[PDB]
Amino acid sequence: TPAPVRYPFGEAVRLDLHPTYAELRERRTLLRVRVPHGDDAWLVTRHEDVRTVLTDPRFSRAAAAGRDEARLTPLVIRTSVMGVDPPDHTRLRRLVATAFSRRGVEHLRPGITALVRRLTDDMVGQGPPVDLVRSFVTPLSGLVICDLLGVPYADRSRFRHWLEAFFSITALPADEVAVRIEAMYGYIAELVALRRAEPTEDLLGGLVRARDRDGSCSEEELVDLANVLLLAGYHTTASQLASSLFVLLTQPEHAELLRSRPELAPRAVEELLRYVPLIAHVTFARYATEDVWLGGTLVRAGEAVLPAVPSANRDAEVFDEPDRLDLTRRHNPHLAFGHGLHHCLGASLVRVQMEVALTMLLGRFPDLALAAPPDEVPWTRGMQARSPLRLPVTW
Ligand code: HEM
C-alpha cells in the first residue's frame, strides 16, 4: 500500500477545484489518502469510477456503520436511508418515494411559484441593495421543506443553529457538535410526539402513522429520516441555489442568456448542478464487501473508498469543455444527485425550486447584478457544502 496523502488537499475556496483532481483523472488511479477522522480510504475521481463506488453492490454503505468510518467530520453522522443497504433501504425509501417523485413534486409548483412571487414582491418594494441569501434563498428553501415536512418555519431561530453542526468539518469543536446534534434529535422527537395525539396532513404525520400503524420503521429510524430530510431541504438546497446565483451573477453573459430564453431553465438547472462543486470535497464513504479492481487498484474487502463527486462532474471523457459553463447542454449525465441506489430523493423538488426561482428572479429583475466585487462575497468556511454567506445585489 502507498504511503497515504493528506486529504482534503486543502481548504475548498469559493467554487474552485484543487488541481489534484484533474491530474488523478488523467492518471486513472485511485489515491490512498489519510482523512481527518477514521480509516484511510481510496479517493475516487473519475466519472466512470465514481458511478461504480456509488451504486455497485460490492460497495456497501451499511458496512460503514460497523467501522470508524473514513470521514471529514469529527463524529459519525446517522444518515438514515443514505447509510443503509437493501433490504432496509427499500423498506424505508418506499415510505417517502411517492411524495418526492416528479409527478408528486409537480403538484407543489403553484405554491412554490406563489412563494417566489411573494419573496420577489418584497425585493421590488424594498429596493436595492438586497442580500439575496437572507431575502430570497433561505426563505424559499426553508419555507418549502418546512411546509412539506411539517416542521414549523417559525422554529428556525432555534433549529437553524443545530443544522450547521451536521455539516461541520473544522468550524466546530467535537463537543459543540455532539451537543447540537443531540439537541436536534430531541427537537425532532418533540415534533414526533405532537403527531401521536394530533395527527397532521404533512410528511411527518405520514411517517409517524407508518411507524405506529404499520411498524415499517423503528422510532430512531423515523427521527433520522425526518432529520435528513430537513437538513437537505433547509441547508443543502439553499447552498446550491446561492452558489448557482453566485455563478450567474459573476458570469453575467450566461444570466442574460437564460433571461433572454427562459425555456433553457431545465438545461440550465442541470448544468448549474454539474458545474457548481456543491460538495466541499467528497460524499459519504463506501466499504467494499469483497475484492474490487478499479482505478489501477484492487480495493480489498473491508477497505474504504471516498467518491469525489465534483471531480467526476468535470470529467473530460463525459462532458465537452467540462470546465466551461454551458447552460444549453442537452444531455447532462452529471452525478450531482448521486447515482443508482442512493440517487437524491429530493432531485425533482430541487429542480422545480431552481427552475422557478431562477426564471422569476431573472424575469422580474432584468438588470440584476452584484453590488460588491465577486472576490469580496463571503463564503462558508470549514463546512461540508459550499455556499456564499451573503449575496449583495442591486438592479
Ligand atoms: C441542490 C440540493 C441537493 C443536492 C445537490 C443533493 C445531492 C445529493 C447527493 C449527491 C446524494 C447521494 C449521496 C451519496 O451517494 O453519497 C443525495 C442523496 C439523498 N438526498 Fe439529496 N441533494 C439535494 C437536496 C435534497 C433535498 C431537498 C432532499 C429532501 C427533501 C434530499 C434528500 C436526499 C436523500 C433522502 C438522499 C438519500 C437517498 C437514498 O439513500 O436513497 N436532498 N443527495
| One-character DSSP codes across 299-313 | EPTT-EEEE-HHHHT
SS3 (DSSP) at 287: strand
Distance CA 301, CA 365 (A): 55
Find out whether 47 and 335 touch, Cβ atoms under 8 Å. Answer: yes
Distance CA 342, CA 86 (A): 11
Task: Specify the ligand 1 atom closest to the Cα of 241.
Answer: 1
Characterize the bridge pairing of strands 5-6 and 31-34. parallel
Residue to substitute in 84, 276, 345, 351 for testing ligand 1 pocket (most ligand atoms within 8 angstroms of CB): 345
State yes or no: 283 annotated in a binding site.
yes
Residue to substitute in 100, 235, 236, 344 for testing ligand 1 pocket (most ligand atoms within 8 angstroms of CB): 344
> How far, in Å, is the centroid of ligand 1 from the Cα of 234?
12
* CA angle, residues 81, 176, 35, in degrees to nearest 5: 60
Rounded to 10°, the helix 219-231/138-149 angle is: 160
State yes or no: 107 annotated in a binding site.
no
The domain locations on the chain are 1-395
State yes or no: 93 annotated in a binding site.
yes
Distance CA 42, CA 178 (A): 27
CA 145 to centroid of chain Cα atoms: 14
> How far, in Å, is the centroid of ligand 1 from the Cα of 344?
4
Distance CA 168, CA 72 (A): 9
| Protein residues whose CB sits closer than 6 Å to any atom of ligand 1 | 54, 81-82, 93, 145, 228-229, 232-233, 236-237, 240, 278, 283-284, 309, 336-338, 342, 344-346, 349-350
Distance CA 234, CA 140 (A): 9
Task: Specify the ligand 1 atom closest to the Cα of 93.
Answer: 41
Residues 21, 22, 26, 31: what is their CA dihedral angle, to the nearest 10 degrees? -10
Name which residue sits closest to atom 18 of ligand 1, judged by CA: 344
The structure's method of determination equals: X-ray
Burial 80-110 (b: 16+ CB within 10 A, else e): bbbbbbeeebeebbebbeebbeeeebeebee
> What contacts 204, CB < 8 A, 6 or more positions away?
149, 150, 151, 191, 192, 195, 226
Name which residue sits closest to atom 17 of ligand 1, judged by CA: 344
Find out whether 43 and 309 touch, Cβ atoms under 8 Å. Answer: no
Which residues of 203-339 form beta strands (DSSP E)? 286-288, 292-294, 297-299, 304-307
- List, as one string, the DSSP characters of 163-224: HGGGTBSSSS-HHHHHHHHHHHHHHHHHHHHHHHHS--SSHHHHHHHIIIII--S-HHHHHH
State yes or no: 286 annotated in a binding site.
yes
State yes or no: 334 annotated in a binding site.
no
Name which residue sits closest to atom 20 of ligand 1, judged by CA: 344
Dihedral pair phi/psi, residue 103, rounded to 5°: -65, -35
Distance CA 332, CA 266 (A): 11
> How far, in Å, is the centroid of ligand 1 from the Cα of 334?
14
Find out whether 372 and 392 touch, Cβ atoms under 8 Å. Answer: yes
Deposited resolution, Å: 2.2
> How far, in Å, is the centroid of ligand 1 from the Cα of 345?
6
Listed in sequence order, the DSSP H helices in 309-375 are 309-312, 347-364
From residue 343, alpha-carbon distances to 164, 290, 302 in Å are: 23, 23, 24
Burial 128-166 (b: 16+ CB within 10 A, else e): eebbbbebbbbbbbbbbbbbbbbbeeeebeebeebbbbb
SS3 (DSSP) at 346: coil
Q: Which three cell numbers stand for residue 301?
A: 474487502
User: Which residue, 302, 287, 282, 216, is CA-closest to 62?
Assistant: 287
Dihedral pair phi/psi, residue 240, rounded to 5°: -65, -40
Characterize the bridge pairing of strands 59-60 and 292-294. unpaired
> How far, in Å, is the centroid of ligand 1 from the Cα of 112?
19
From residue 223, alpha-carbon distances to 89, 161, 193, 205, 216 in Å are: 15, 18, 11, 12, 13
Distance CA 383, CA 285 (A): 17
User: Which residue, 321, 319, 345, 344, is CA-closest to 332?
Assistant: 319
Task: Specify the ligand 1 atom closest to the Cα of 54.
Answer: 15
From residue 373, alpha-carbon distances to 213, 290, 376, 382 in Å are: 56, 51, 5, 22
State yes or no: 196 annotated in a binding site.
no
